[PDB]
Amino acid sequence: TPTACCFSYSRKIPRQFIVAYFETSSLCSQPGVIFLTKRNRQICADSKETWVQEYITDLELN
C-alpha cells in the first residue's frame, strides 16, 4: 500500500468520480481513507463518516 497520511479530510463528492480507494498506512495516527479519482488524483476523507463507508462498500462491489 502507498505510504501517505491524511492531514485534513475532504468534502463529499459524487460517486461517479471515485474509481478506487485504500486505507492509509499504519504510520498515520488517525485512520483515513484515500480515494483515487478518475483524474488519477488522491483525495483524503474521514473513514468515520457514512458516505465514506458507502463509497467503500460500493467500490468493493465492483
Binding site: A4, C5, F7, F17, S25, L27, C28, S29, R39, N40
Partner: protein, 379 residues
C-alpha cells in the same frame, strides 16, 4: 521583478543518453547532456531537529503524480575557509532509505579545466517523492553551492531542477514550519510546508473546455519529518507525505463531459484542438508529455515525451526521446494551429470501461494541460 521559479525546455543532443554512473561530469555538463527540461530555483535551509534541513521535490511540476521514476541528486560541495565542516557531516535521505551520508566524488573535465567536489545519491520513487539535505551547525549551509536533481520520468524525458544557494529567484521556494497535529506517529515529528511558485502562463482544459488558468503555478508540499519508534546511536530521519485535502473542491470537473468528445474509430481515438503554444514559444523548444492509464486499482502507465523545435531544420516536427510511442501519436498543423492526438484503444466498447489520458505541452513561459476521459480501454 520576476523572483519566482523558472523553467527552460532544452534541446538535448543525445535524447537516448541518461545519467551515467559513476558521476563523471560537472553539474553544468550533466544538465547539458541529459536534461530536456530544467527548473531554476533557490536552495534554502531551515534549522530543524538539530541540523539545517533543506527539502526539495524530485519533480517540481507533477505531470503524473503516481508514475515511478529514477531520480539522481548531485550537489556541489565546498566549505569556505572559516567553516570547519566535514563531508561526513552532510546527510541526505529520500523515498527509499533513512538519513545517511551520501557518497562523494571529485570530477574533472580537461575540456575547460574545471574541477568540482560533488556528492550524489540515487532514488527511485513517484513524482511526488522528496529529497532532504541536512547539514550541521549554523554555517553548514554554506558548503552546498548548488543542488541538481535529475528525474527520468516514465516517458523517458529528463526533468531536472537546479537549486542554487543565493539564487535570484528567492520567492520560487518558501518553506515554513507548521504544526503536525499529531497526524503521524513519527517520534519528534516536525511538519514543513514548502511552497513552490513558478512563473508560467498555465491553462488546464478537459478536452476543449477550459478548467483553470493563471499566470503562476503554485504547489504546496506538506511533509512530516521524524524518526521511527525504537526500543532500548544513529539518528536516521525519514519523511511522510501529508495530504491536506480540505482546501480544494471538485468544481472544475463538475462541468466536464463525462466522456471527452473525440473522433472514435476501430483501433484509436483522435482529439483535435487549437493551440498557440507553438507560436508563443518564439523559436523555443516545446516539451510534450502524454500519459494514460486505463486502470483503477492499477494498470500499465503508458507514457511518452517529445521535444518539438519551433524553428530551424526539420521545423515543427516532434522529436522522440523514448524508443518510440506506440500508445500515443501527436502531430501539429501550423496552417490551422491545431494539434491532433491519437490514442490506441481496444476495438470493443463496454460498460464500466473508463480510461484517462493527460497531455501536457509546455514551453519556457506557457503550459497547456488537457485531460481526456475515455469510455474505452487503453492499449
Amino acid at each position: 521583478s520576476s523572483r519566482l521559479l523558472t523553467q527552460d525546455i532544452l534541446f538535448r543532443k543525445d535524447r537516448q543518453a541518461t545519467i551515467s554512473l559513476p558521476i563523471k561530469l560537472p553539474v553544468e555538463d550533466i544538465i547539458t547532456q541529459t536534461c530536456d527540461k530544467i527548473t531554476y530555483g533557490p536552495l534554502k535551509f531551515l534549522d530543524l531537529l538539530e541540523k539545517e534541513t533543506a527539502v526539495l521535490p524530485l519533480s517540481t511540476d507533477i505531470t503524473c503524480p503516481a508514475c515511478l521514476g529514477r531520480a539522481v541528486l548531485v550537489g556541489k560541495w565546498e566549505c569556505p575557509a572559516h567553516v570547519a565542516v566535514n563531508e561526513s557531516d552532510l546527510t541526505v535521505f529520500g523515498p527509499n532509505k533513512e538519513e545517511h551520508v551520501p557518497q562523494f566524488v571529485t570530477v574533472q573535465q580537461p575540456s575547460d579545466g574545471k574541477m568540482q567536489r560533488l556528492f550524489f545519491a540515487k532514488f527511485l520513487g513517484t513524482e511526488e517523492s522528496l529529497a532532504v539535505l541536512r547539514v550541521p551547525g549554523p554555517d553548514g549551509h554554506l558548503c552546498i553551492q548548488e543542488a541538481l536533481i535529475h528525474f527520468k520520468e516514465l516517458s523517458g524525458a529528463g526533468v531536472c531542477s537546479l537549486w542554487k544557494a543565493n539564487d535570484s529567484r528567492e520567492e520560487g521556494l518558501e518553506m515554513k514550519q507548521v504544526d503536525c497535529l499529531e497526524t503521524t506517529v513519527l517520534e519528534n515529528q516536525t511538519c514543513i510546508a514548502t511552497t513552490l511558485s513558478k512563473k508560467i502562463y498555465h491553462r488546464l482544459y478537459c478536452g476543449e473546455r477550459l478548467m483553470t488558468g493563471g499566470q503562476v503555478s503554485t504547489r504546496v508540499l506538506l511533509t512530516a519529518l521524524g524518526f521511527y519508534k525504537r526500543q532500548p546511536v544513529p539518528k536516521g530521519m525519514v519523511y511522510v507525505h501529508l495530504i491536506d485535502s480540505g482546501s480544494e473542491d471538485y468544481m472544475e470537473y463538475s462541468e466536464c463531459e463525462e466522456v471527452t468528445p473525440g473522433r472514435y474509430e476501430d483501433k484509436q481515438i483522435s482529439y483535435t484542438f487549437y493551440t498557440d503554444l507553438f507560436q508563443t514559444a518564439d523559436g523555443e523548444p516545446v516539451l510534450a508529455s502524454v500519459w494514460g492509464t486505463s486502470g483503477l486499482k492499477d494498470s500499465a502507465y503508458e507514457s511518452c515525451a517529445f521535444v518539438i523545435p519551433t524553428d530551424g531544420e526539420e521545423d515543427l516536427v516532434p522529436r522522440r526521446i523514448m524508443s518510440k510511442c506506440y500508445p500515443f501519436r501527436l502531430t501539429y498543423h501550423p496552417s490551422t494551429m491545431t494539434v491532433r492526438l491519437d490514442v490506441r484503444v481496444e476495438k470493443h466498447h463496454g460498460a464500466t470501461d473508463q480510461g484517462f489520458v493527460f497531455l501536457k505541452m509546455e514551453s519556457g513561459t506557457y503550459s497547456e494541460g488537457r485531460e481526456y476521459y475515455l469510455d474505452r480501454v487503453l492499449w
